[PDB]
RNA sequence: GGGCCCGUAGCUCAGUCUGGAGCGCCUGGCUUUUAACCAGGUGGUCGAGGGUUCAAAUCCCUUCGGGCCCGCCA
């Protein structure tokens, strides 16, 4: 049970990352752990509830980092 | 080769040989062709003892990698299964007999079954002996891929009647069917 | 002329490329993930490499120039496919250009056809974890023969790991086999169209453990495995009645395999081809070309339809570029 | 230009002295020889294959019996009292062998009838279905396999 | 017909001198899952009979099958 908040300079990039990552989020047939992936203004919030939790948080840190760096 | 148009003792026979495939190493080619001829003769002979109709064996030659075998009028299972759908059932029986008696035929295709009067298993080249259901399951998988690649349009009925025959002859069929899913699992995720 | 940017993250070889429809590749780059001790991943390498490769892509060509983005949505490792998909979606939206998720294997075939002679090929695609023979039958690309446990590349890699040769063990095992003199007795399984390289690999491991000379063991392993591959290629050639075969994939680097296939095709009166080393291995250029070809004929793709497909099949592509 | 002379003789007294007399002959238990083919096949296999026995005219018996072993082949298919099959090459030696062995010429004993087929199957362990002559030729052809 | 050798777990071999482990698959982790990697499980009481031995698969005999050799040829 944890929350990860990420803030970005602009709502434009916030939506960028959110809708480039949400399709991946919903593309997983069976999830590592219970997840929530939501857009709050110019920020993205992830909620985790599970080992599997550590993998999930690392994987999502990586997805978001890649999405950020693509710019 | 396989084309001779000869009659041993007035018996119509075609001597089949394995032309030396030069692309591979000489010694490995020798070993493979020798073992293939040995196993083909072995099992084209042995299967008959299971009541599984096949061509005859009349002379082996490991020195020349040749086997002489009674010819059967040209009617291939691959070329008739779409026309006659009962030969798939018949293949079911004459391959479930193999599986029940612990013999593996690792080239299962509708090209390896002639049908003039009954179902002749006219090749057994890659045969083997196994008491493990996994080898039988993989052989069934090979036949499944062959039937798909040839006549997938009728795969439904072909496999349905193949399983009908397999049920009719083989008794522990469900065990190997369940084991098949383990091999079907190779496709990664 | 429309141009596209493709990524490639199905395996350890993070590829990025930009290719045009004129018949040339503007840019291509690949970073092969060096394996650690047997925990980073191909996906980690993709995440920390695709930004850099894309920076070089920007440097060599302006962002607004590229008209389409493609990406290898499958088949391949899950996390790596997902990293390439994430980057593909992000770049698609950022540049306001459409996204396409294309198939790795068919991509290999189309790059082979583009770079090599022009044909409709029987492609023996062999790589680290994707061995199979593919071709165009029933107006689609469909598998014919494949391994059931392990691919040829993974077989060689695991042999190298057992003999402790440093990764990659490809050239090392090739040279040791070249040195070898006698071919140890190893299993030779060709289950119709398929292969089971697990038996060969395990038997070679046991034979080496028994004390048989390393060069002889490597020669045995190589000759047996690549003979099985050549035989399934013969069977597929007979099955499809095609007119030419193509070696494709990373293991295409093995001169012995190449010569074996060449001698085969010479004996059977058929033509053997193979893409240059720049295109054999996984790279972004091939995915770029496949996406460009898909969108050329007018095959759009909703951004929601670009999911990863780990268990992608070469027939699930509605091949419509003929 | 003379194919091996093959004749079935019935009601012939068997004398062990013939073997040590010294001559080129073969005597086969007529109850198991399926037909003329069952011995033409053995002739061809002895002529072509790598010999298993020191003698051509004893390899004939070994092949006709199928079993590689010589003791079993002799004790089983070797000619016994009464009906027998004579494999020979020349008329004068054939005449002498006929005079010594005795019996009457009737090839019908070579042919197969219900009892003969039952005995052939029982003694060759021929399970499964197939033409008798072809299948026994097969069982005799499978010698060249470990 | 005879002599020598072989037979142990689902697979492969030590253990026969003189009285089990590996592989396979399963389970948890390893970045859920694997490509690989690490840990626990699953596994015979040893071809069969007889005798010896407190104590044998382990020493002797017979047989069951398998491999090597000896052949004595009607």
User: How many Å apart are CA B141 and CA B148, to the nearest integer?
Assistant: 10
User: How many Å apart are CA C155 and CA D112, to the nearest integer?
Assistant: 58
Residue C287 lies in domain: 3-109+279-305
Interchain CB distance below 8 Å, B42 and D145 = yes
At residue A5, the 3 state secondary structure works out as: strand
User: How many Å apart are CA D119 and CA C116, to the nearest integer?
Assistant: 69
* Domain-wise residue ranges, chain D: 5-141
**CB contact residues (below 8 A), chain B span 45-104, against chain C:** none
User: How many domains are contained in chain C?
Assistant: 2
Write b or e for each residue in D57-85: b if 16 or more Cβ atoms lie within 10 A of its Cβ, otherwise e. bbbbbbbbbbbeebeebeebbbbeebbbb
Q: How far is CA C171 from CA B47, C175, D128, in A?
A: 45, 6, 54
User: How many Å apart are CA B130 and CA C31, to the nearest integer?
Assistant: 45
The strand pairing partners of B120, in sequence order, are: B114
The CATH number of residue C66's host domain is: 3.30.420.40
Q: Examine the fold and report which residue of B70, B99, B125 is the final residue of a domain before the chain moves on.
A: B70
Q: How was this structure determined?
A: cryo-EM
Is B70 in CB contact (< 8 Å) with chain D?
yes
Q: Beta strand C244-248 with C271-273: parallel, antiparallel or unpaired?
A: parallel
The packing angle between helices C152-162 and C170-179, to 10°, is 80
Active site (annotated) includes residue B107? yes
B65 lies in the same domain as B152: no
Residue B3 assigned to a binding site: yes
C298 lies in the same domain as C186: no
C11 lies in the same domain as C141: no
* Overall resolution, Å: 3.6
Under 8 Å CB-to-CB from C265, ≥6 apart: which residues? Answer: C244, C245, C271, C272
Q: How far is CA C197 from CA C132, C148, C235, in A?
A: 12, 8, 17
Residues of D in contact with B127 (CB under 8 A): none
B149 lies in the same domain as B130: yes
Which helix (H) or strand (E) segment is C53 a member of?
Answer: helix C42-60
* Token pair of C147 as six digits: 């391994």
Look-up of token digits 């001597």:
B15
Query: Does any domain span residue B1?
Result: no
- Torsional sign, CA C88, C90, C92, C94: negative
At residue C6, the 3 state secondary structure works out as: strand
* Closest of C28, C4, C23 to residue C97, by C-alpha: C4
User: How many Å apart are CA B88 and CA B186, to the nearest integer?
Assistant: 27
User: Is D5-141 a domain of CATH 3.30.365.10?
Assistant: no
Nucleotide nearest to A28 (CA to C1'): E32
The CATH number of residue B179's host domain is: 1.10.510.10
Separation between the CA of C209 and the C1’ of E13 (whole angstroms): 13
Neighbours of chain B (3+ CB pairs under 8 A): C, D
C286 lies in the same domain as C269: no
Task: Give the number of other Cβ atoms within 10 Å of residue C183's Cβ.
Answer: 19
CB D41 within 8 A of CB D141: yes
Is C304 in CB contact (< 8 Å) with chain A?
yes
- Report which residue is nearest nucleotide E2 when distances run from CA to C1': D71
Q: Where are the alpha helices (DSSP H) in chain B?
A: 26-46, 77-80, 86-100, 133-151, 155-169, 173-184
User: How many Å apart are CA A2 and CA A35, to the nearest integer?
Assistant: 10
Task: Give the number of other Cβ atoms within 10 Å of residue C133's Cβ.
Answer: 25
B165 lies in the same domain as B105: yes
User: How many Å apart are CA C231 and CA C228, to the nearest integer?
Assistant: 5
- Report which residue is nearest nucleotide E66 when distances run from CA to C1': D146
Phi and psi angles of residue C286, each rounded to the nearest 5 degrees, phi first: -65, -45
B60 lies in the same domain as B124: no
Q: Beta strand B11-17 with B66-70: parallel, antiparallel or unpaired?
A: antiparallel
Is C85 in CB contact (< 8 Å) with chain A?
yes
Look-up of token digits 């290629």:
C233
Active-site position among B79, B107, B133, B135:
B107
Interchain CB distance below 8 Å, A70 and C54 = yes
B83 lies in the same domain as B58: no
Q: How far is CA D128 from CA A9, B52, C289, in A?
A: 84, 8, 61
C285 lies in the same domain as C266: no
C40, C47, C309: best to mutate for the A interface, most A CBs within 10 A: C47
Q: Which residue spans within chain C are E strands per DSSP?
A: 3-8, 13-20, 25-32, 68-74, 99-103, 122-125, 132-136, 141-146, 244-248, 271-273
At residue D38, the 3 state secondary structure works out as: helix
Is C5 in CB contact (< 8 Å) with chain A?
no
- D contact set with B (CB within 8 A): 37, 40-41, 44-45, 48, 126-130, 134-135, 137-139, 141-142, 144-146
Q: Give the angle subtended at the CA of C136 by the CAs of C134 and C139, to the nearest 5°.
A: 140
C145 lies in the same domain as C18: no
Going edge to edge, which strands form the sheet with C122-125?
C141-146, C132-136, C122-125, C244-248, C271-273
The strand pairing partners of D9, in sequence order, are: D84, D105
CB C45 within 8 A of CB C25: no
Residues of A in contact with C79 (CB under 8 A): 59
Among the partner-chain residues D129, D137, D146, the one whose CB lies closest to the CB of B58 is D137
Is B155 in CB contact (< 8 Å) with chain D?
no
* Token pair of C181 as six digits: 């003199």
Chains D and C: 3 or more CB pairs within 8 Å of each other: no
C254 lies in the same domain as C156: yes
Going edge to edge, which strands form the sheet with C13-20?
C25-32, C13-20, C3-8, C68-74, C99-103
User: How many Å apart are CA B34 and CA B29, to the nearest integer?
Assistant: 8
B99 lies in the same domain as B176: yes
Domains of chain A in start order, with CATH, are 2-70 (3.30.310.50)
User: How many Å apart are CA C181 and CA B37, to the nearest integer?
Assistant: 26
Give, as ranges, the nucleotides of chain E with any atom within 7 Å of a protein CB: 1, 10-11, 23, 25-26, 28-37, 67-68, 71-74
User: How many Å apart are CA C287 and CA C221, to the nearest integer?
Assistant: 33
Look-up of token digits 């110019």:
A42
User: How many Å apart are CA D25 and CA C6, to the nearest integer?
Assistant: 85
User: How many domains are contained in chain B?
Assistant: 2
The packing angle between helices C152-162 and C197-209, to 10°, is 20
CB D32 within 8 A of CB D79: no
CB B146 within 8 A of CB B76: no
User: CB contacts < 8 Å between B and C, how many?
Assistant: 73
Q: How many residues does chain B have?
A: 189
DSSP C178: H
Q: Give the angle subtended at the CA of D139 by the CAs of D134 and D142, to the nearest 5°.
A: 120
* Token pair of A12 as six digits: 């434009």
User: How many Å apart are CA C236 and CA C234, to the nearest integer?
Assistant: 5
Q: How far is CA B27 from CA B30, C211, C224, in A?
A: 5, 22, 11
Is C75 in CB contact (< 8 Å) with chain B?
yes
CB C121 within 8 A of CB C304: no
Residue B13 lies in domain: 6-70
Query: Does any domain span residue C314?
Result: no
Long-range contacts of C266-271 (CB under 8 A, 24+ apart): C267/B21, C267/B22, C267/B23, C268/C234, C268/C237, C270/C237, C270/C243, C270/C244, C270/C245, C271/C117, C271/C119, C271/C243, C271/C244, C271/C245
The distance from CA C261 to its chain's CA centroid, rounded to whole angstroms, is 17
Among the partner-chain residues B51, B52, B60, the one whose CB lies closest to the CB of D141 is B60
Q: Beta strand C132-136 with C141-146: parallel, antiparallel or unpaired?
A: antiparallel
What spatial distance separates the first Cα and last Cα of chain D, rounded to whole Å? Answer: 35
Question: How far off is chain C from B65, nearest CA to CA, in Å?
Answer: 18
* Token pair of C299 as six digits: 């095959």
Separation between the CA of D70 and the C1’ of E70 (whole angstroms): 14
Q: Examine the fold and report which residue of B25, B52, B70 is the final residue of a domain before the chain moves on.
A: B70
User: How many Å apart are CA C51 and CA C57, to the nearest integer?
Assistant: 10
Interchain CB distance below 8 Å, C79 and A59 = yes
* Token pair of C62 as six digits: 């302006």
Query: Does any domain span residue C316?
Result: no
The packing angle between helices D36-48 and D132-141, to 10°, is 20
CB C58 within 8 A of CB C22: no
* Token pair of A27 as six digits: 């593309």
C127 lies in the same domain as C270: yes
CB C73 within 8 A of CB C85: yes
User: How many Å apart are CA B187 and CA C80, to the nearest integer?
Assistant: 16
């Amino acid at each position: 049970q944890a929350k990860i908040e990420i803030e970005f300079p602009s709502e434009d990039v916030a939506k960028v990352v959110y809708e480039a990552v949400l399709y991946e989020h919903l593309s997983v047939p069976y999830r590592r752990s219970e997840i929530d992936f939501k857009l709050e203004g110019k920020k993205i919030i992830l909620d985790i509830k599970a080992s599997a939790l550590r993998g999930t948080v690392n994987s999502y840190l990586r997805w978001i980092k890649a999405a950020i760096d693509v710019i | 080769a396989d084309i001779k148009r000869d009659s041993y003792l007035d018996f119509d026979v075609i001597i089949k040989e394995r032309v030396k495939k030069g692309y591979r190493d000489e010694r490995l080619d020798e070993n493979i062709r020798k073992s293939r001829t040995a196993r083909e003769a072995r099992y084209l002979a042995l299967v008959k003892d299971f009541g599984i109709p096949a061509p005859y064996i009349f002379d082996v030659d490991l020195d020349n990698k040749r086997i002489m075998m009674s010819y059967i009028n040209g009617k291939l299972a691959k070329d008739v299964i779409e026309d006659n759908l009962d030969i798939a059932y018949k293949i079911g029986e004459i391959v479930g007999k193999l599986h029940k008696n612990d013999v593996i035929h690792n080239d299962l295709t509708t090209s390896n079954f002639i049908f003039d009067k009954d179902l002749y298993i006219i090749d057994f080249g890659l045969g083997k002996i196994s008491n493990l259901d996994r080898d039988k399951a993989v052989d069934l998988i090979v036949f499944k891929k062959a039937v798909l690649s040839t006549h997938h349009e009728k795969f439904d009925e072909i496999w349905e009647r193949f399983l009908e025959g397999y049920k009719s002859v083989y008794d522990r069929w469900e065990i190997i069917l369940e084991l098949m899913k383990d091999v079907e699992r190779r496709a990664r995720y | 002329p429309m141009i596209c940017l493709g990524l490639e993250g199905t395996a350890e070889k993070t590829g990025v490329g930009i290719v045009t429809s004129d018949g040339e590749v503007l840019f291509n780059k690949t970073i092969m993930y060096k394996p650690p001790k047997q925990p980073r991943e191909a996906a980690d390498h993709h995440a920390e490499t695709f930004p850099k490769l894309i920076k070089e892509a920007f440097e060599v060509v302006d962002k607004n120039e590229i008209d389409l983005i493609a990406f290898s949505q499958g088949p391949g490792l899950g996390p790596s496919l997902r990293v390439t998909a994430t980057v593909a979606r992000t770049l698609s939206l950022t540049l306001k250009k459409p996204i396409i998720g294309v198939n790795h294997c068919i991509a290999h075939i189309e790059i082979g056809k583009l770079t090599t002679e022009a044909e409709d090929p029987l492609t023996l695609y062999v790589s680290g974890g994707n061995t199979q023979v593919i071709a165009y039958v029933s107006k689609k690309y469909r598998v014919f023969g494949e391994t059931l446990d392990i691919a040829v590349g993974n077989c060689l890699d695991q042999f190298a790991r057992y003999v402790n040769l440093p990764h990659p063990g490809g050239p090392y095992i090739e040279e040791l086999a070249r040195k070898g003199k006698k071919l140890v007795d190893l299993p030779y399984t060709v289950k119709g169209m398929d292969i089971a390289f697990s038996g060969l690999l395990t038997a070679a491991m046991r034979a080496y453990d028994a004390g048989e000379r390393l060069e002889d063991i490597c020669y045995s392993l190589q000759e047996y495995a690549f003979s099985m591959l050549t035989e399934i290629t013969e069977r597929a050639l007979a099955h499809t009645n095609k007119g030419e075969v193509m070696l494709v994939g990373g293991v295409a680097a093995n001169n012995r395999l190449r010569e074996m296939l060449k001698a085969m095709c010479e004996g059977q009166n058929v033509d053997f081809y193979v893409p240059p080393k720049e295109f054999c291995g996984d790279n972004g250029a091939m995915i770029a070309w496949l996406g460009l070809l898909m969108h050329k004929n007018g095959r759009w793709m909703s951004l929601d339809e670009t999911k990863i497909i780990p268990n992608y099949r070469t027939d699930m592509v509605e091949v419509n570029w003929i | 230009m003379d194919p091996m002379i093959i004749r079935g003789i019935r009601g012939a007294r068997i004398n062990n002295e013939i073997f040590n007399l010294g001559l080129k002959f073969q005597i086969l238990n007529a109850d198991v020889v399926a037909t003329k083919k069952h011995v033409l096949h053995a002739i061809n296999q002895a002529k072509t294959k790598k010999p298993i026995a020191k003698s051509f005219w004893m390899e004939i018996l070994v092949r006709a019996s199928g079993q590689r072993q010589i003791h079993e082949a002799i004790k089983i298919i070797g000619a016994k009292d009464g009906n027998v099959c004579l494999i020979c090459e020349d008329e004068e030696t054939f005449r002498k062998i006929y005079e010594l062995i005795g019996g009457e010429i009737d090839d019908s004993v070579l042919e197969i009838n219900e009892d003969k087929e039952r005995l052939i199957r029982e003694i060759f362990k021929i399970r499964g279905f197939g033409n008798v002559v072809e299948r026994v030729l097969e069982k005799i052809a499978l010698i060249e396999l470990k």
